Design a protein around this ligand. Structure first.
Ligand SMILES: [Cu+2]
Ligand SMILES: [Cu+2]
Ligand SMILES: [Cu+2]
Ligand SMILES: [Cu+2]
Ligand SMILES: [Cu+2]
Ligand SMILES: [Cu+2]
Ligand SMILES: [Cu+2]
Ligand SMILES: [Cu+2]
Ligand SMILES: [Cu+2]
Ligand SMILES: [Cu+2]
Ligand SMILES: [Cu+2]
Ligand SMILES: [Cu+2]
Ligand SMILES: [Cu+2]
Ligand SMILES: [Cu+2]
Lengths: 271, 270, 268
């Protein structure tokens, strides 16, 4: 259980998007990946650099109403204002009542709750979302982590036929965090790969009856994640991921998981 | 288990609504909570007090076609009529061939199947829905149970910005039953609390790999439930629950889980 | 693990439809059920008999990009062309990193990826879909398997009020494969029966905490399956299955699981 501190800034981007960043003028969409171990406390020294009220609200983690990031709990930030948000986490364990307390561990996310509406509809639309992973002791750690956000009809707020693409090598342990926002349900599909429908996205062993899937229905504020061995049993290639709702996939919102051979090459593809 | 008998009434209510009740003029939307233990049998002496055919149909439980509650199986109820429905439940166990028979236990629900359409579209819209809990031997029992129904764009058929709110004290074991009906998908979200995506909404112990969530996609006739310790690790507070579909949350369709300190107070909220 | 070889054909059908068949002129919607055991390899000698490009794309199974069935990987089929697709499967096992590799076993599906659009919107709409089951050693095998596809507002591309109905006898072990396609989310409900939300749709034992359900939200390209003992604890009957989205159920998009007594009768 470390007590940890980061700085976070909400910025309006040149293009009129809105992003979180770890430093001024370094905002990204999605926002920076926050990673904590169960038991860790994080203090986020947040600065709203924008000319509108903005906030930081987190799913899954332990927070008091004063870190709700809502108008209801007097927890949003005035233009140019500052606020320290506090996120706590806990390990699982036996309560006195003999019950098992579930831990914080999982694939989570943070987003604005007051831009445009008192539910953050405008901030979320403009890019104020990012991933949070809470790890349990012993969890398997990846070679890389990639965050895919279905935000209305967009992926990571990109234009149609502009990715995002993620590169790996065959055999790499690659982690995906998959977050949904906005108005629409979606189905997330990845070619050539599959994962478990459980906390880690990985089967614990032969006694784990979790469905193994390559396609998952998601709605606004859903988060899940998984890890794959890149190209396992399928080889190097351009492995598309996309929404499987037919009108959505036809808008040209598709990304590629580019799995290269150890010589840096990939079977030829036509994007 | 035990053999149980109850009366149930379907009644027209104010503002063109329809509800189930355990007594005449005590109909509620949602309808009364029905709670059974695996193995129990329930006989429901159902009176349709309305001027249109109505029925009772249940998810999850054991029932014969004579208690289907459908026109197909001639088990709806004529206006002003009475019919006894029978719900059975069973415990899990190995079959003779060594497969495992799943038990009845879970978060379930009952609704009308013949008002407006032969799928109960009018009856459900107007409020003919309620919760059923079937418990397993050794299940953890709560201090209170609250039912939240996303019915089209309404919560429990309340208009925009009309709660419902649920009160607890820090430390209470609070059960939620979450049912969806109608036309739309939703995502159910609760601030400051989380649960397991499994039968009871609680992890069985360290071998249970179920995802821990605070947001769940649901569609018409989905039911799930869970228990939380009120304010566990987060303290007293006005803890919002709402649909996270942004247009739905922006219509005011929000309620509060009001978690008080033992001294009866709650951190100031607006 | 066996190496298996089949032929498949894509063909235009009546009423503006398209389907897959094991023989020319024998295409069905849904397409033929393909059943494999973990470790089996299947080579599909696919002939596109149509006047438009078409492909075969599979969920869940092991395939190389040369069997992706996509424009991106140039592995669709010209009109009148033939292509051998290869699907591999694997058993689960312990990896050299100490993790458990998930096996191929599950309820899966295949469909076109290039008719109408580069995502197969037109091919899927018109009937180019079918079920795939991959079994694990020791899995419980059914007496009968039935495939239900929610494709847009249709079931198995049947018109409103067109079933399909499935017949069983009380005590039969009946498997359902449930696949969704198109534009819409659905909720699949079956009267009188329930299943586990897990890989097999059956609880493995008392240590399996999976929710037991009779209603499941599904979206495009979702697949799940389950087995039930027909009429278990409920008896013979006409047992409705339907989408539970109310306007969907109201269109006539409903079928029956017709469970007979041992003497052949159904409560009428
Ligand atoms: Cu909120
Ligand atoms: Cu989509
Ligand atoms: Cu795909
Ligand atoms: Cu695919
Ligand atoms: Cu949120
Ligand atoms: Cu090229
Ligand atoms: Cu029904
Ligand atoms: Cu909603
Ligand atoms: Cu929240
Ligand atoms: Cu129902
Ligand atoms: Cu695809
Ligand atoms: Cu439907
Ligand atoms: Cu039903
Ligand atoms: Cu697909």
């Amino acid at each position: 259980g470390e007590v940890r501190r980061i700085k976070l800034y909400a910025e309006r981007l040149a293009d009129g998007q809105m992003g979180y960043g770890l430093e001024k003028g370094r905002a990204t969409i999605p926002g920076p990946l926050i990673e904590l171990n169960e038991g860790d406390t994080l203090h986020i020294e947040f600065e709203n650099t924008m000319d509108v009220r903005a906030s930081l609200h987190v799913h899954g983690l332990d927070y008091e109403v004063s870190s709700d990031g809502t108008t209801l709990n007097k927890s949003d930030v005035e233009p140019g204002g500052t606020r320290t948000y506090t996120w706590r986490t806990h390990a699982p364990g036996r309560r006195s009542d003999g019950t098992w307390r579930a831990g914080s561990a999982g694939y989570w996310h943070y987003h604005d709750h007051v831009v445009g509406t008192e539910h953050g509809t405008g901030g979320i639309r403009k890019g104020l979302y990012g991933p949070v992973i809470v790890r349990r002791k012993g969890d398997v750690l990846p070679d890389a982590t990639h965050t895919i956000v279905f935000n209305d009809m967009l992926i990571n707020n990109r234009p149609a036929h502009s990715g995002p693409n993620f590169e790996a090598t065959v055999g790499d342990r690659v982690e995906f965090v998959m977050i949904t926002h906005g108005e629409y349900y979606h189905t997330f599909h990845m070619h050539g790969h599959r994962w478990a429908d459980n906390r880690t996205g990985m089967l614990t062993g032969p006694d784990d009856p979790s469905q193994v899937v390559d396609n998952k229905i998601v709605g606004p504020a859903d988060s899940f994640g998984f890890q794959v061995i890149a190209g396992e049993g399928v080889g190097a290639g351009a492995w598309m991921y996309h929404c499987h709702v037919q009108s959505h996939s036809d808008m040209g919102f598709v990304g590629l998981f580019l799995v290269k051979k150890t010589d840096g090459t990939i079977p030829g593809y036509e994007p």
